[PDB]
Each structure stands twice: as C-alpha cells, then as structure tokens.
Design an enzyme around this catalytic site. Structure first.
Site, PDB file in Angstrom:
ATOM      1  N   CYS B   1     -49.801 -44.596  30.236  1.00 51.21           N
ATOM      2  CA  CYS B   1     -48.452 -44.005  30.482  1.00 51.21           C
ATOM      3  C   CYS B   1     -48.515 -42.986  31.583  1.00 51.21           C
ATOM      4  O   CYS B   1     -49.595 -42.574  31.999  1.00 51.21           O
ATOM      5  CB  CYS B   1     -47.942 -43.344  29.213  1.00 51.21           C
ATOM      6  SG  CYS B   1     -48.317 -44.369  27.807  1.00 51.21           S
ATOM      7  N   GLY B  27     -48.213 -48.332  33.160  1.00 51.02           N
ATOM      8  CA  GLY B  27     -47.784 -49.272  32.138  1.00 51.02           C
ATOM      9  C   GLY B  27     -46.415 -49.817  32.514  1.00 51.02           C
ATOM     10  O   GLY B  27     -45.686 -49.224  33.317  1.00 51.02           O
ATOM     11  N   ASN B  98     -48.140 -38.208  27.487  1.00 45.46           N
ATOM     12  CA  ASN B  98     -49.153 -39.171  27.918  1.00 45.46           C
ATOM     13  C   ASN B  98     -50.470 -38.729  27.267  1.00 45.46           C
ATOM     14  O   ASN B  98     -50.856 -37.560  27.344  1.00 45.46           O
ATOM     15  CB  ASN B  98     -49.240 -39.210  29.467  1.00 45.46           C
ATOM     16  CG  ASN B  98     -50.541 -39.846  29.997  1.00 45.46           C
ATOM     17  OD1 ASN B  98     -51.083 -39.398  31.032  1.00 45.46           O
ATOM     18  ND2 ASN B  98     -51.015 -40.914  29.334  1.00 45.46           N
ATOM     19  N   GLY B  99     -51.028 -39.585  26.429  1.00 46.09           N
ATOM     20  CA  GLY B  99     -52.255 -39.221  25.751  1.00 46.09           C
ATOM     21  C   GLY B  99     -52.202 -39.786  24.350  1.00 46.09           C
ATOM     22  O   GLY B  99     -51.501 -40.763  24.118  1.00 46.09           O
ATOM     23  N   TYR B 238     -61.197 -46.534  37.055  1.00 50.26           N
ATOM     24  CA  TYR B 238     -60.335 -47.673  36.883  1.00 50.26           C
ATOM     25  C   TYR B 238     -58.822 -47.337  36.902  1.00 50.26           C
ATOM     26  O   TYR B 238     -58.108 -47.796  37.756  1.00 50.26           O
ATOM     27  CB  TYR B 238     -60.687 -48.364  35.547  1.00 50.26           C
ATOM     28  CG  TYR B 238     -59.700 -49.405  35.183  1.00 50.26           C
ATOM     29  CD1 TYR B 238     -59.550 -50.526  35.982  1.00 50.26           C
ATOM     30  CD2 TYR B 238     -58.825 -49.236  34.102  1.00 50.26           C
ATOM     31  CE1 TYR B 238     -58.575 -51.445  35.733  1.00 50.26           C
ATOM     32  CE2 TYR B 238     -57.817 -50.147  33.853  1.00 50.26           C
ATOM     33  CZ  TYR B 238     -57.701 -51.244  34.684  1.00 50.26           C
ATOM     34  OH  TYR B 238     -56.635 -52.083  34.555  1.00 50.26           O
TER      35      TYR B 238
END
Ligand SMILES: Nc1ncnc2c1ncn2[C@@H]1O[C@H](COP(=O)(O)OP(=O)(O)O)[C@@H](O)[C@H]1O
Ligand SMILES: Nc1ncnc2c1ncn2[C@@H]1O[C@H](COP(=O)(O)OP(=O)(O)O)[C@@H](O)[C@H]1O
Ligand SMILES: Nc1ncnc2c1ncn2[C@@H]1O[C@H](COP(=O)(O)OP(=O)(O)O)[C@@H](O)[C@H]1O
Ligand SMILES: Nc1ncnc2c1ncn2[C@@H]1O[C@H](COP(=O)(O)OP(=O)(O)O)[C@@H](O)[C@H]1O
Ligand SMILES: Nc1nc2c(ncn2[C@@H]2O[C@H](COP(=O)(O)O)[C@@H](O)[C@H]2O)c(=O)[nH]1
Ligand SMILES: Nc1nc2c(ncn2[C@@H]2O[C@H](COP(=O)(O)O)[C@@H](O)[C@H]2O)c(=O)[nH]1
Ligand SMILES: Nc1nc2c(ncn2[C@@H]2O[C@H](COP(=O)(O)O)[C@@H](O)[C@H]2O)c(=O)[nH]1
Ligand SMILES: Nc1nc2c(ncn2[C@@H]2O[C@H](COP(=O)(O)O)[C@@H](O)[C@H]2O)c(=O)[nH]1
Ligand code: SF4
Ligand code: SF4
Ligand SMILES: [Mg+2]
Ligand SMILES: [Mg+2]
Ligand SMILES: [Mg+2]
Ligand SMILES: [Mg+2]
Lengths: 455, 455, 455, 455
Positions: B1, B27, B98-99, B238
């Site tokens: 996210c 996402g 986010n997390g 990544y």
C-alpha cells in the site's frame, strides 16, 4: 498495425489472441480475430486493446482451425480489421493489411466509377473490391491479379472457409514471417509472436511472394518477378519489439549495435548513460557498453499512463507535474548525462527529457540519437507516418540541439545505421528503406497520394 | 500500500491523484482520496486502479486544500482507504495506513468487549476506535495515546477539517517522507511521488515521530522516545520504485550495487546477463557492469497482461504459450546466461524463467539473486507478506537450485546485502529489518498475531 | 425501502433476489443480500437496481440457507443495506431497516458520547450500536432492550449465523408479513413478494412483536405490550404494489374503492376517465366503473425513461417535447376528461398533466385525487417523506385547482379514504396513520428530529 | 423497427432522440441517428436502447438541421441503422428501412454478380447498392428506379447533405406518417412520436409515394401508379403504441373496440376481466365495458425484467418463482376470470397465464383473443415474423384451449377484427393485410424468399 494468422490448429483463435497480444504494441486502437472451422467463418473484433475487446465480447464465440487477426494502430468500428465479407453463393473472405497503399485514392475512384460502394476507410477494402471485380476463375488468381495493381507497402492476410493466403509487397517494406506449430503454419508481422505462442521460425515471406496455405500444406507463387528489397528502417530502430528478429537480425542486438555505432561516431566525456523507457533502452545499453560509462535508469516511464489517465492541466505541468516520464535525480543529480534516444520526430520529447534531467540536477545533457535525422514523410503505414511537423525537416542538427536545449546532439550517420543493423544484401543501402531520412523513396509517390493519416 | 498527503494546495486532490498514481505499483486493489476545504471533507474511493476509480466516479467532485489518499494492495469496498468518519458534534476524521499491526487481533477484542462495532477488516479502523474511546481532550493527544498501544508496522495519514497528522511506527519499518510544494507540505510512502508532482524532498519522518500540519505549519512531537531503526529490506530489494530514494539512498543505485555485490561474491563465466523485467533490471545492470559480461534483454514482460487477460489453459502452457514473460532466443540462443532476479519466494517464477531460457536455446542458466534466501514470514504488511509457502524455508540453496533447474544458484549474503545498500547506521544490521531472511524480528510477535493476509 | 428475508431454503439467496425484485419499486438506489450457511455469512450488495447489482457482481458467490435483503430508496455504498458486522469472538450480525427512527439524532449523540464511531448514515447502524453496547446475555434480549429505545417507524430484519430476527415498531407503521415456502419462513415488506416467489401468506407481524426464526422454528415475543395501530396510509394510496394485500386488504381493490368513493363524493359530467400510469390506474378504473364514464388510456408513460435518459432542454420542453408522460389526443381530443390521480404533493405533475391534456385537445379536465390533501411532513421513511414544499400546506383546494389549471379539483375526504380502504379496527381512524393529511402524528416528534432526507 | 426523420430544425438530432425514444418499443436491439448541417453528415449509433447508445457515446457530437434515425428490432453493429455511406465526389447517403424485402435474396445475388460487396445483413444496403449501380442522372430518379425493383414491405428514410427522401411500398404494409413542427417536416413509423416531440399530424405517406423534402419544401412523386392497400393488421392488434393513430384510427380505441367485438361474439358469464400488461390492456377494458363485468388488474408485469435480469432456474420456476408476470390472487382468488389477450402465437404465454391464474385461485379462466388465430408466417418484418412454430397452424381452436388449459377459448373472427378496427376501405378486407391469419398474402412470395429472421 500487426497481423497474425495460423492455419491448422484446434485453438487457432486462442493462439491468435496470444499472438496478437504479443503484437499489441503495434497499435491499440482496435483488434479483431476471424476464424474458420471449414464451413463457417466466426469473428469478433472491436475498438481498444485485445483485452478490452475480449472478455468484453467472448473469445469462446469465435472458434475454428484457422484464423487471422489484426491489431490496429490509429490516428470507427467499420475500420477495425480483419474485414469480413460474406456472399450468397461464393462463401466468405476476410482480409487484414499492414502497410499503406500509395495509390489507394486512384483505385477507389476507379472502383467507384465502376460502381463499388466503400463502407470503410481502409486499404484492405480496396483489395476486397479488386478481388471481386476481377475476371479470373479462381481466387488465388483474382488476388494475384489484384495485388499487381497495388502500389505501396502491404502485408496481407486473407482467408476463406478453406484456405489462408498471405502476400507481401515486392519491396518487403513491412516484415512478415512464417513459423510452424507442429504441422500448423503461422504468419506474423514480428517473430516475437512466435516466441510467445510456441511457434518455430521458418523463414520470411519473400517480397512479391504469395502463400496459399490449406489443409494439405503451403504453396508459394510470385506475383511480381522483379523485387526491390527495402524494409522499413524504423522497424529496426524503433517500431518492432526487441525480442523480434527482423530477417534473422535480432532487434535488441541491432539497436544495441546502433548504440556502439553512436559511441564510435561521437563519443563524449560523461558520467552516466540513460536510455528512455522503452523506446531507447537497447541503444543506451550498447552505447554505455562501448564507451565504458555506466548505464543507469536516469528516466522512469510511469507504467499506468493509459488513455484513462487525466492529463495534468498545463498550469500544473508548469508547476512540475510529470505525465509519462520523469528524471531520476537520485541518479543524475550532479552527473553529466548522455541521454540516448532511438529517434527524433517533432523534437518535443527530447526537449522535455533534457529539461527534466536538468531539473533533476544533471550538469550536462548530451543527446545522442540512434537514427539519422528524420526529414521526410513516410507513406508506408499510419503507424510509421505522422501529421506532426518534422523538426529535422527545417532545422539543422545544431539548430535542433538548441531547441531541445542539449549540450550536444548527435545523430547516427546513415552508414552507421546501415553498419549497425548489419544487413547483408548487396546494394548501397542494404535492402532498407531510408526514405524518411534521405528523401529517396523506394516506390513512386503519385500526386493524388495522401499521407496515411489523411484517410 | 502507499499513502500520499498534501496540505496547503488549491488542487490538493489532483496532486494526490498524481502522487498516488506514482505509487500505483504499491497495489492496485483499490484507491481513494479524501480532501478538505476547511469545512467539509469530500471523498471518492473505489476498487481497482486509480484510473478505474476516477473517470468512473469524478475527480471534480472531490475538492479541497488538503487531502490524503491511499493505494491499496490486496490478496470489499469497505476496506478501500482512506477510511472516513463523520460525527454530529465533533466533525470528521479520515485515516490511511500502510503497514500491519501485529497486535490488531488483541485490540479488536478489547475494543469489541468495550462495545465497538467493526465494519471494515482494516487496522486503520482499530486506530479510529482507539482514538474515539480515548480519554484526552485533544485529538493530537488521543492519537499519541492510541499510537502507543499499537504494535507493528505503521505509517499513518490522518486528517480532519483543520489538520493533517502523520505518524510513523518507532521502528520506521515502512518508509515515509516529507516534501515541500512551495509552502505546501507533502507526505508520501516513496519519494518518487515528489519527483512526479513537483515536490522537493525535505526529510524522512522519524520512527516514533508525529507531525501535525495545518494552516500555520508543521510541528513534530514524539510518541515513543526509544526507537529501534529497522526499515523493511524488501523496500530496497524489490518493493519501491527505482526512482525513489529510501532515506537518501536511491533505489536504483542501491539495487545496482546489490548487483556489483553479487558479482564480487559469486562471479561465474558466462556470455550474457539478463534481468527480469521489471523486478530485477537494476540488479542485472549492476552485475553485468561489474563482471564485464554484456547486459541484454533476454527476457520480455508483456506490457498488457492485466487482470482482464485470459489465462492460457494449462494444456496450452504445456504447448508453450507464455503469459507474462518470455525468453528472447534472438539473444540467448547458444549463449550461457546469467539470470539475475531480485528475490525468490515460492521459487515458481525462477523455475519457469530457467525453463523458458533453455527453450530459447541458452546453453547455461546461472541464477543469481540479489537477496539472501527468504525463509521467514513477514508480519509488517499484506504487500510484503504471503500465504504461499517459502521454498527457502525448507530447501537448501541446493534443493532450490535443483528445483528451478539452474546450472548454478547464488544468493546475496546478508553482509553483501547490507554492504550493497550501504546504509550507514551504527548497529549489526544498519537499521534494516532482515526478519524474513534471518528470523530475528525487530518487534515481538504475539501468539494471537495473524499473518497480514489472514485478515 | 423494502426488505425480504427467508429462513430454511437451499437457495435462500436466489429467492431473496426474486423476492427483492418484486419489491424493486420500493426504491432503486441500492440493493443487497446477506446469506448464511450456518457458519459463515456471505454478502453482495451495491448501488443501483438489483440487476445492476447482480451480474455486475455474482449472485453465485452469495450462498446460504437463510438470507435477508434490502432494497434502498434514496434522495454512498456505505449506506446500502443490509449492514453486515463481524467480530472476533461473537460472530456476525446483519441488519436491514425499512422506516425511520424519529429519535436517531438523540441516540447517535448518546452513543457517540459513549464512544461509538458511526460509519454509515443509516438508522440500521444505530440499532447495531445499541445491541452491542447493551448489557444482556443474549442477543434476543439485547435486541428487545435496544428496540424499546427506538422511536418511529421500523421494520427490521436481523440475522446471524444461526437465526433470523424480525421486529416491527409497535405502531406497525410499515407493513411486514410472514409467509411459508414449505417449511421455510419468509418475511417481506409487501405480500407481492410471496406471490412472485411461491410463498404462502401466513400473517402479519404484529406491531411491537418480534420473531425469532431458526432451524427449529419461529417464536414470537413482545417488546412493547401497549401498541397503537397506525399503518401508513400511503402504502394503500400509492406506495405498495397493486397485487399486494396490506393486512389482507388488496391494494388494487382498495385503490379501486377509493375511486368508487371519489365517484360518490364528487361526481361530475364528463366523457372519458383516465388514470396516470402507473400511480393511479386502479383508482381511475374504480371511478369510471362507478360513474359509468368509459375508462380510457388518455395518458401514456414511456417505459424507458430510466436515469440514463437525457432530460430535454427546458427550451425543448417549451417546444413540446415530453419526458415521461404524454396525453393521447387520439383519445381525449374533443372530450371532457376526468383525470384521476392517487395524490398531489408538490402539484407539479398534475399541472403538467392538465396542460398536456389540453394540448391534446381535451375540452375539460376534472382532476380527482384519491387522497385527502397532503399538508404535513412525513417522518416515517425517506421514501414517504420529501424535501419538496407541499402545495396543500399553503394552498386551499381552490388555489391548487387554479395552480394545476384544472376545471375542477376534488380530493377524497378522510372518511372517504378510511371508508374506501375498509379497515375494520375500532378507532376514529381505522388503525391508519393520517399524519401528512391531518397533522396528528401517531408518535411524538422531538425537537432534534430531522426529516428523513436530512440524513 | 421504427424510423423517425425530421427536416428543418436546429436540434434535429435531439428531436430524433426523443422521437426515436417514443418508438423504442419497436425494438431495442440497436439504435442510431444521422444528422446533416448542409455540408457534413454526423452520426452516432450503437447496439442496445437509445439511452444505452447515448450518454454512452455523446448526442452532442451529432449535430444538424435534418436527421433520420432508426430503432432496430432483432432476433452486429454493422446492422444497426441508419446505414451511412460516403464517397469521394458524390457526397453522402444515409438510409433506414422498416419492413422486409421479399426478393432481397434474388437482388443480392444479382448485385453480387455485378460486383457488389455486402457488408451488412440488411435490406437497407440492397437499396443502397441499387441506387449506386443505377443509370439515372439524379438520386431522386436512381431511387425511384431502385424502388420499383423491390418486392415486399418497406418504409424508407433516406438522406444526404441536402435532402430527405421518404418512400413507402405500394401496399403501405407499414405505417408511415408526416407531421409539422412549425416549418419542419417530420416523418415517423407511428404518430405517437409526434405527440411526444410536439409535432402536428399532417397525413400518411401514400403507398407507392415518395417524398423529397429539402430547404424549400416537400414534393411528392409516385413510383408505383397501381397500389394495393394492405396495412399490417398486427400494427393495430398489438405492435403499435396505444396513443398512435394508424391512418387516423386510434390504436387504443381500435383495440378497445376489438374487445367490444369479442364481447358481442362470445360473451361468457364471469366475475372479473383482466388484460395482460401491456399487450392487451385496451382490449380487456373494451371487453369488460361491453359485458358489464368489472375490469381488474388480475395480472402484473414486473417493470424491471430487462435483459440484465437473471432467469430463474427451471427448477425454481417449477417451485413457483415467476419472471415477468404474475397473477394477483388478491383479485382473482375465488373468481371466474375472463383473461383477454391481443393474440396467440406459440401459445406458451397463454398457457402460463392460465396456470398462474389458477394458482392464484381463479375458479374459471376464459381466454378471449382479440385476433383471429395466427396460422401463417409473416414476411414483412423481423419484428412481425418469428422462427417459433405457430400453434394455430396445427391446432384447432378447441385443441389450443386444451393446450393452454383454458375453460373456454375464443378468437375474434376476421369480420369482427375488420369491423372492430372500423376499417372501411372498398374491398373485402378494408385495406389490411391478414396474411398470417388467412394465408392470402398481399404480395407474391418467391421460392428463394427467406423468412425475415433467416437473414
Ligand atoms: N513488452 C515489451 N518489452 C519491451 N519493449 C517493448 C515491449 N513492447 C514494445 N516494446 C518497445 O517499446 C518501445 C517503445 O516504447 P514506448 O516507451 O511506448 O515508446 P515511446 O516512449 O517512444 O512512445 C518500442 O521501440 C519497442 O521495441
Ligand atoms: N514505472 C516503473 N518503471 C520501472 N520500474 C517500475 C515502475 N513501477 C514499478 N517498478 C518496479 O517494478 C518492479 C516489479 O515489476 P513487476 O515485473 O511487476 O514485478 P514482478 O515481475 O516481480 O511481479 C519493482 O521492483 C519496481 O521497482
Ligand atoms: N410491476 C408493477 N406493475 C404495476 N404497477 C406497479 C408495478 N410496480 C410498481 N407499481 C405501481 O406503480 C405506481 C407508481 O408508478 P410510477 O408511474 O413509477 O409512479 P409515479 O408516476 O408517481 O412516479 C405505484 O403506485 C405502484 O403501485
Ligand atoms: N409507453 C407505453 N405505454 C403503454 N403501452 C405501451 C407503451 N409502449 C408500448 N406499449 C404497448 O405494449 C404492448 C406490449 O407490451 P409488452 O408487455 O412488452 O408485450 P408482451 O407482453 O406481449 O411481450 C404493445 O401492444 C404496445 O401497444
Ligand atoms: N520515429 C518514431 N518515433 C516514435 C514514434 N512514436 C513514438 N516515437 C518516439 O518518439 C521519439 C521522438 O518523439 P518526438 O521527437 O516526436 O517528440 C522517438 O524517440 C520514439 O521513441 C513513431 O511512430 N516514429
Ligand atoms: N519478495 C517478493 N517478491 C515479489 C513479490 N511480489 C512479486 N515478487 C517477485 O516474485 C519473485 C519471486 O517469485 P516466486 O519465486 O514466488 O515465484 C521476486 O523476484 C519478485 O520479482 C513480493 O511481494 N515479494
Ligand atoms: N404521495 C406521493 N406521491 C408520490 C411519491 N413519489 C411519487 N409520487 C407521485 O407523485 C404524484 C404527485 O406528484 P407532484 O404533485 O409532487 O408533482 C402522486 O400522484 C404520485 O403518483 C411519493 O413518495 N409520495
Ligand atoms: N402477435 C405477436 N404477439 C407478440 C409478439 N411479441 C410478443 N407478442 C405477445 O405474445 C403473445 C403471444 O405469446 P405466445 O403465445 O407466442 O407465447 C401475444 O399476446 C403478444 O402480447 C409479436 O411479434 N407478435
Ligand atoms: S520512410 Fe522511414 S518509417 Fe517509412 S518505411 Fe521507410 S524507413 Fe520506414
Ligand atoms: S405521515 Fe403519511 S406518508 Fe407518512 S407514514 Fe403516515 S400516512 Fe404514511
Ligand atoms: Mg525513444
Ligand atoms: Mg523479480
Ligand atoms: Mg399518481
Ligand atoms: Mg398480449
């Protein structure tokens, strides 16, 4: 535009979906597949991408053992190919074209004076009309006869209930190749389609050759004994996919050698080499590798900037909002940069890229183009032609370097281009068309001839 | 996210569109913007991409001078953030996370036992409930109090009619940065968002810090004095975009050095180096550059393989139909290839890539991964976690090697990883979380803790 | 709004689709079904019609043996019901409401002061919060307790993994009935749902009654011993479907008697009787039949004037372009017409209808309304309430006549209305609410009470 | 199918939208408008309803002062009319047809042998081809000449940059009428279009007449001196809208007299008369009124059963789930019912209606049809033709009664039909076609002639 056909495969329409998918870069303004079981021709086609067209209209409906499919580049549903035609007594004909007929205006009037009605804007339809209003007993012959009246670039896929017929203009301006899937026969604008669908390369279709493929095999037949090899240069420089081999020469490899050539012609002293995704990555890799300067991603293309995407207001763009590309200052800040691009047309992109790069804090921008300047119109495809004015047509290289704001600007020479691609044919330009660079067109351009977009 | 907020800009919602767009890779399973003019909060949000959500629901409707927006990764509309809450007397609150909260199960029951109803599945909602059912007079304080009860990874954007409040977990597991657009303040998961919208980098939000931004500026306040730096390694390896600088270290550059590191650890003799688009292009470039082996595009990712795309039947794939990627035999045929990838998880991709490459006629495939094996679960995001089994968790580098079918397989060591990224922080792991490699998690994992997907 | 539930049927969600479909007229601004297999609750719901919601989101996904569904009328997908709530330890609760809680503002603040967060704008959510923040051991009891705190109109469907719970406000302002499909139990706002799905009528849910239905049957339990019968009059006059029987009195038949009543009160001499499709067809049939004047289709409603329909420019409408209705001059030209309508609210429709009829060459228009004037607000549903000003509230019958331009105007008296419908309860108004006519509301209207639209 | 044209109006395309809308019942399988400003012809058209076609493709784009539009019934986009044709030198031609050319097969082959390509499946295209491949100097003449070669039913709207040309087959099998909007001229399949858009009736287009309308007015010209009046009977019985006057006879009124006729022919003793919405409402009203039995809504058609609607599984339907219609037992329970329908074709609907009615507890069902049995194919429109087998073609009346399960079954006699419509044209069948009842077709049916669906 891109065309894909295959004959002799239970799932010919699925294969075509996939083949056509691998050619989706050729244009995204429509797409269609026509397939035959031996009796009936089924067909779905629509505007947009192949995926917008299928599962928005079922692929299951189109069934067969042969199909031809077309992916359209555009500048109306009636124009999305393949074109399919039916008849009371004489069965069906589907046709798909990649290229442009430089005498189409002429022929349309003649055919209109003979009483033909035209319902699409395509060259493909003209071929349909010549075939119909042709004397000969057989279609093979009606087509051969019709073909010989066409002037320009054309790769044609044609098919009926019983056969597939493939033909390439006697200059072989557009690529067209043949492959095998077991016993099936496959024909595609680019080889990458073969890679993608599990087809083995066989050979190129010969300029001025015509293939008739059916349940007992393929046969070749000329329709123009004298041929004058001049494949579009831009296919190599820009337009094809890098995993494609145009005439056995790989497009990535070629474009990388174009970079090595640029490095040998006009090396400059610098800190990083960036390409532009995705047009000029292979050139940039080649350039960096030749010069010893490190290859970096100094520019990023946003992966999701489709036609759905809302254009920033011009005021926002002045503010600094980017659209498709931006410069990575993480990479270029304080560096002097060689920015390698495949080509320049309007010049608008290179100016922008030079500006963003400077706004990411590059100290120098050295623009190096892996093509000779583009100063003449193309007449051999809507994809390859443009309505936009050509900067190279009125601006000297230095006049151009000032407009994009580069520190230096370098174009590949023609020898460099020809040498880089490494094409073997025996003549002063290696069987390539260089018209848009040189002004020397490989076919005659009539006075009634319109620019491909003008249709 | 990914989360994007900006305070103090006429077109805050447009900027958020563009910022969020640049974070779209984070996402694509939903997206939303909430904006405030000072009086009312406007909001549009939906499932799918940002573009599927806007111009499918108008961006014009959402108007303001501050906005926060969220782009959701997922494995229901109710879960698409930001979450917005309104009240009779106390105005409004929008929140985006986010997390992942490693104690969310605990807290939900407690809050449910106190009489809270839960309508979404998100951690973000838990924070909303703690804030409401909190004693303190002000929100700033309700939040600080609430925050201190959360365990796990969390970057939070929160906003009301009058302010924006930003907070980062005291491990700073997810990135979060601040930038300036003139006098506006901008906050984003990744810096590339700044590049894209014209924002200048200011600094990172400090782990355990909290920002309150409003019409008279920004103020910082701690909510956890003791902090233990451990930023997600995968962000570097990544997950982030290559034009982003995590903590001033550029993600492209870092990943390229991870390539140089791989080359120094386990050089092998080979003909071409390919990356995998797009996960491991920068590593590959770096590796090739170190070793002197030429960088090639020996693999191509089809640009149009969206969720619309029809999966080839498993029988077709046996036939050789490709989906997302294919090997360029134009490039690899007859070569021995180093294939560099960012990471291995299930292992399924690398096996496939090795197989395609051999089917394009590569003589050797040497798989070199720019990460240590991934043998432990992540608990700090749905994006970063997975329900798929980890190959590295039960297979030695060898059993893997054999499973993908590589000639050789080489993972970056942990020192190589740390050295490659080149974070300067003083402790045995440079302020990075390495949990999924090492098993040593930087926060405590309770027994009620579910894997991020399990919600 | 309309609600449908059924317990004990393999295809409970399909039945609900169909049941809800037959109630689609109740509103078209959203729709949803929640179903249970005994373990899990499945749910799909969206905005628009039931068909826009299903096969735009699969009905196959929602599976169970019980389900409840809701069809929403509207003047946010967060507001589309049923509302579904899940919990860590206590399983799930879905709730659907038809009616309006005249103390909802009060309760929301109280519940907000106790620390409830509100995420929808619905009354249904308030009930959810009272149930949660309720002391009793069982849900049955939590609900009974919660119910007794609600003021206004409410038919509630509630269900969990294991049961369905149905409750009607102790005035029975909205209809709610029970039916049988074999051994299944079915509950619907209107009986027509039963007709449509193959359900047998059982009885009405009693005002102040509560049903608990589960795999071993149905049990009834009061939650308000003292009840005061006052069913919405508009359900009879206008709002229900003509094939529905409200309390065993058929809605077509009732409305036709209302026509006979009109004929007995204020017969006039005329040539044709037309209704307005579809609001006042049954009244018109009854009127004509009483008077002996012939029933004609002197007005036609265009079947396809959905929300997709482009409104004619106001200039076009001046030109004479019609939207939904037009007058058949084929029928009325030269005739004197009685135009029968169910009701008048704003007055805007009747004026238009009178004008079109005169433009089709009717010589007289005699407007006869099968309801007393509507001069007071409704507070017992968004469907039944309006933000538009009431003409009858400031205009005498005469004025209203002058405003619509009728030759004569006639409203049904209250006795006529009561007499026409024919309800047999012993009190001065037959167990009907007549608030919007009389101003005498059957529940207390608080000072904080908002109009149903105001939410 | 339905056609609407208007010449001489700023907003001709909007008017056409509205006119076409009022003819939307004619078919919903496509729709299109073509408009002209005097120079260019603009056009939007697509599949589905007019509203699915516009605001899904902008009406604003199509602009002009004349337009013709078509609404297509269908059992391809290429087939959606109007058909528009452009040319290099000779400008443009749009054509729209309602009817069916009983020699189209013949003509297609001839035109195909002369070298015409056919791209649609429409008769309209055949006319286009005859016009083109016609000798005469002017279009007016090319058309007249082409028309005289057509056999069958045809109302044609044709237009170019400068004119509109209207023509009706010399039997006048389909209605076509002319109206005035100020100085504008309007032409529609049905008069209801005029009512709806503010047009005044002028007269019918004469069978075998041709109108040329342009900026200086309208002129009439024959193209078939000998005419044989035989208007489709089903237009009166079923197919037109009840507010339309076919040849000055109102369709509602006519259908009502068809009910009076039924009542005079075969009165039976009963309790209620119901029609079927919406096919046979006017007949039923008329019948009830004649007999003195009360008109009731004993059957209800669900207003929202579009193509989106999910068909109940056949098992559900056995269970008793209804689709489009259901019987009101509130009305029929314990009654003996006369069910009046416009016609019977397959018989499947009447059987179903009889069954539902008995399942609502009607004690008797007396089915009375306001048309003679339908025992012969139609050849004069896809709308009016069918591929379904005709029950009346193989079953005696008394054999149909047994099949639908009625207590009694009664068809209108032919005299009754002719008498009811009131028609008096000086021949044994009043200028009506009765082919599908009598077998006596008003034009010759060739051996190559396909049924309208067969195309
Ligand atoms: N799947 C793919 N992978 C890599 N390159 C591709 C792919 N499809 C097309 N291309 C390449 O993309 C290049 C152009 O990319 P793009 O960035 O869209 O062009 P431009 O920026 O000039 O508009 C072409 O030169 C072509 O070789
Ligand atoms: N616009 C972009 N340009 C280049 N790389 C991008 C862009 N957006 C995201 N990425 C990168 O894409 C990588 C993953 O791409 P993708 O091929 O979709 O991953 P994977 O193949 O592993 O599923 C990420 O590591 C990220 O850095
Ligand atoms: N399927 C149906 N068949 C007949 N009448 C229906 C149906 N569904 C709803 N109705 C009726 O439609 C009436 C209102 O129709 P409509 O014309 O939409 O109302 P209005 O014109 O006042 O907006 C209601 O009074 C109701 O009884
Ligand atoms: N707006 C309208 N109002 C009333 N009747 C209409 C309207 N439009 C079409 N009709 C009528 O509807 C009838 C058929 O309605 P429908 O119920 O759809 O037919 P069927 O049930 O036979 O399929 C036609 O006979 C026609 O006169
Ligand atoms: N030559 C060429 N370049 C194209 C075409 N379409 C996009 N491009 C891209 O546009 C670049 C030049 O853009 P321009 O200078 O016109 O702004 C080339 O680098 C290439 O990447 C095309 O049809 N031809
Ligand atoms: N580590 C990681 N790799 C991912 C993720 N999503 C996609 N990938 C890609 O998946 C590759 C490994 O895929 P797998 O081995 O599971 O088949 C990595 O190279 C990376 O490119 C993710 O969430 N985490
Ligand atoms: N009473 C009432 N009539 C309604 C409602 N919605 C639509 N109508 C229709 O509106 C008519 C009156 O419309 P108005 O006078 O407001 O223009 C009534 O005949 C009825 O047919 C509603 O909620 N209540
Ligand atoms: N005659 C006729 N009736 C039609 C047509 N389309 C629908 N109908 C309806 O279908 C009814 C008969 O249906 P069927 O007997 O075929 O099941 C007629 O009452 C009429 O209402 C059509 O094209 N022609
Ligand atoms: S003119 Fe240029 S773009 Fe056109 S065919 Fe020749 S090389 Fe290709
Ligand atoms: S006030 Fe009128 S509309 Fe409202 S519940 Fe009572 S009768 Fe119905
Ligand atoms: Mg480029
Ligand atoms: Mg990867
Ligand atoms: Mg009404
Ligand atoms: Mg009927």
């Amino acid at each position: 535009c891109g065309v894909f056909g295959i004959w002799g495969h239970e799932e010919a329409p699925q294969i075509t979906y996939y083949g056509l998918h691998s050619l989706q870069h050729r244009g995204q303004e429509g797409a269609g597949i026509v397939a035959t079981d031996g009796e009936k021709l089924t067909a779905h086609k629509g505007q947009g991408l192949i995926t917008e067209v299928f599962q928005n209209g079922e692929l299951s409906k189109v069934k067969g053992k042969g199909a031809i499919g077309h992916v359209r580049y555009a500048t109306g549903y009636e124009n999305v190919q393949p074109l399919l035609f039916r008849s009371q007594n004489n069965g069906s004909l589907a046709l798909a074209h990649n290229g442009n007929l430089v005498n189409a205006t002429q022929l349309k009037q003649q055919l209109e004076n003979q009483g033909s009605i035209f319902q699409t804007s395509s060259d493909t339809e003209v071929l349909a009309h010549l075939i119909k209003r042709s004397g000969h007993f057989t279609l093979k012959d009606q087509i051969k006869n019709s073909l010989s009246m066409l002037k320009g670039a054309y790769a044609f896929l044609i098919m009926t209930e019983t056969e597939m017929i493939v033909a390439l203009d006697p200059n072989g301006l557009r690529p067209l190749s043949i492959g095998m899937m077991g016993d099936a026969y496959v024909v595609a604008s680019e080889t990458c389609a073969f890679d993608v669908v599990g087809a083995t390369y066989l050979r190129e279709v010969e300029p001025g050759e015509m293939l008739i493929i059916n349940d007992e095999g393929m046969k070749s037949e000329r329709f123009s004994m004298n041929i004058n090899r001049s494949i579009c240069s831009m296919e190599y420089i820009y337009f094809s996919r890098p995993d494609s081999n145009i005439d056995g020469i790989n497009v990535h490899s070629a474009r990388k050698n174009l970079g090595k050539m640029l490095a040998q012609e006009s090396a400059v002293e610098a800190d990083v080499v960036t390409g532009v995704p995705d047009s000029s990555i292979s050139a940039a890799i080649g350039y960096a590798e030749a010069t010893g300067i490190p290859y970096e991603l100094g520019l990023i293309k946003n992966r999701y900037v489709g036609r759905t995407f809302i254009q920033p207001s011009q005021a926002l763009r002045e503010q600094g909002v980017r659209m498709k590309l931006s410069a990575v200052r993480g990479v270029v800040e304080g560096k002097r940069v060689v920015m390698v691009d495949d080509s320049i047309v309007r010049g608008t992109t290179s100016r922008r890229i030079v500006t963003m790069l400077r706004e990411a804090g590059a100290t120098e921008v050295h623009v190096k183009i892996s093509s000779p300047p583009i100063a003449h119109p193309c007449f051999y495809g809507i994809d390859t032609s443009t309505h936009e004015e050509l900067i190279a047509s009125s601006h000297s290289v230095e006049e151009i370097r000032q407009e994009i704001g580069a520190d230096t600007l370098s174009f590949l020479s023609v020898e460099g281009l020809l040498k880089g691609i490494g094409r073997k044919y025996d003549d002063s330009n290696c069987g390539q068309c260089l018209a848009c660079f040189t002004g020397k067109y490989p076919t005659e351009i009539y006075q009634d001839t319109v620019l491909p977009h003008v249709k």
